[PDB]
């Protein structure tokens, strides 16, 4: 019955800045029956504030809550990299409902990825499939390109990549790309190369290996 709208949808701020999160209700929220939750990747939401302005146990003093009636606000005075998460407001004046959430992202200086390449295991080769993995470690920002070159031949359509969320400590991303080959095709070629293009790199970096060397 009570609908909660959160603004903004996405918030991008540098460290040390103050963040203002808005919550708007379709109807008045009785008394001060409002709560804020912080949800980090791969984790259950944690109660941040209840009763509009009451700090939950274990919550840093930089978090503050205010507002009444139709308008509520959550404010983070001095942002930290660990404060990267999604934030939900909840009313419990009536039957419990949630806001759609406001994602808070961290801005930082450009960082170049550290690149590692991994051969498929001998154990996996018995399965008749070869997986070659390329790791891109701790780079900002996100836009990155990975090239698979097998014996000087560019590979398309046989790879997939996966990116982590912003790191809790350093606000950086990490990426994994897996090149999938059959055992048969994998044994045919010698040189497997991973080529990374990124903003932090002045020139593309290439990591490679020779099969059976």
């Amino acid at each position: 019955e009570i609908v909660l709208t959160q603004s903004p949808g996405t918030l991008s701020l540098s460290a040390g800045e103050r963040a203002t999160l808005s919550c708007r209700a379709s109807q008045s929220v009785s008394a001060r029956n409002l709560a804020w939750y912080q949800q980090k990747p791969g984790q259950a939401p944690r109660l941040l504030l209840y009763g509009v302005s009451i700090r939950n146990t274990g919550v840093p003093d930089r978090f503050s809550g205010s507002g009444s009636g139709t308008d509520f606000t959550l404010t983070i005075s001095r942002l930290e990299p660990e404060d990267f998460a999604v934030y939900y407001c909840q009313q419990y004046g009536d039957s419990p409902t949630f806001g759609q959430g406001t994602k808070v992202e961290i801005k930082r200086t450009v960082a170049a990825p550290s690149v590692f390449i991994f051969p498929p295991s001998d154990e996996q080769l018995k399965s008749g499939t070869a997986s070659v993995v390329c790791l891109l470690n701790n780079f900002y920002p996100r836009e990155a390109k990975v090239q698979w070159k097998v014996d000087n031949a560019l590979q398309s359509g046989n790879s997939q990549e996966s990116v982590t969320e912003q790191d809790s400590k350093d606000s950086t991303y990490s990426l994994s790309s897996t090149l999938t080959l059959s055992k048969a095709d994998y044994e045919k070629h010698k040189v497997y190369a991973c080529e990374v293009t990124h903003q932090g790199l002045s020139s593309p970096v290439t990591k490679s290996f020779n099969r059976g060397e």
Partner: protein, 229 residues
């Protein structure tokens, strides 16, 4: 106060979902207990709650589909969701709610804000059968290196459904660990990789083992990762 939950996880379409949450905290009587669900990459949705009395209130939208029950003898409460659809694919959470207060002229929930929560249970609605993962090592080069750091990992291949929990040395090392979100392969089986960056010197001296657990297939795997030499 601790909350453990266990559930079917994988369900064919139109079947009922049954999840159970166990409260080890004590004070079972004190508070109402709620179920809350979150479909992947979306918002939280409150399903319903119940008291050891067994009185319960449900979300009006999900009405006629929700049952909740209480086992006071074992300090447990359960959720029943009828006729599951791919629409209902989500992570279902145990949570401690507000108190259920009985007064002279009014009966209600007060302070219905959720804390603490359970780790959650990812429920997948599909006709496809379950399958355990294969765990392969991502070996370090063993090269001289010009850099202190080295990277090693595990490749968890071909499993269904989500999720997989990966740890390193039983949680002894957590620093510099990255477990990537699973990718949906063409085969229709999930795959993921978990890596950790360590000092190059520790490669020879320190043992590295990733601990892969796949609950739906009850597979627990420990794989030693050492340089290829």
């Amino acid at each position: 106060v601790q909350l453990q939950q266990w559930g079917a996880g994988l369900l064919k379409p139109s079947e009922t979902l049954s999840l159970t949450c166990a409260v080890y905290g004590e004070s079972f009587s004190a508070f109402s207990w709620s179920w809350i669900r979150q479909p992947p990459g979306k918002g939280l949705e409150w399903i319903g709650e119940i008291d050891h009395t067994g009185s319960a209130n449900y979300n009006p939208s999900l009405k006629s589909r929700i049952s909740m029950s209480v086992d006071t003898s074992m300090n447990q409460f359960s959720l029943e969701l009828l006729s599951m659809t791919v629409a209902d694919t989500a992570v279902y959470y145990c949570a401690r709610g507000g108190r259920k207060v009985y007064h002279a002229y009014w009966s209600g929930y007060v302070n219905n804000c959720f804390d603490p929560w359970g780790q959650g249970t990812l429920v997948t609605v599909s006709s496809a059968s379950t399958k355990g993962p294969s765990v392969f090592p991502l070996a370090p080069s063993s090269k001289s290196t010009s850099g202190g750091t080295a990277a090693l990992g595990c490749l968890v291949k071909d499993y269904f459904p989500e999720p997989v929990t990966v740890s390193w040395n039983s949680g002894a090392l957590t620093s510099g660990v990255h477990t990537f979100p699973a990718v949906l392969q063409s085969s229709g089986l999930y795959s993921l990789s978990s890596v950790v960056t360590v000092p190059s010197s520790s490669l020879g001296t320190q043992t590295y083992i990733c601990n892969v657990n796949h609950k739906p297939s009850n597979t627990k795997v420990d794989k030693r990762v050492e340089p290829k030499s």
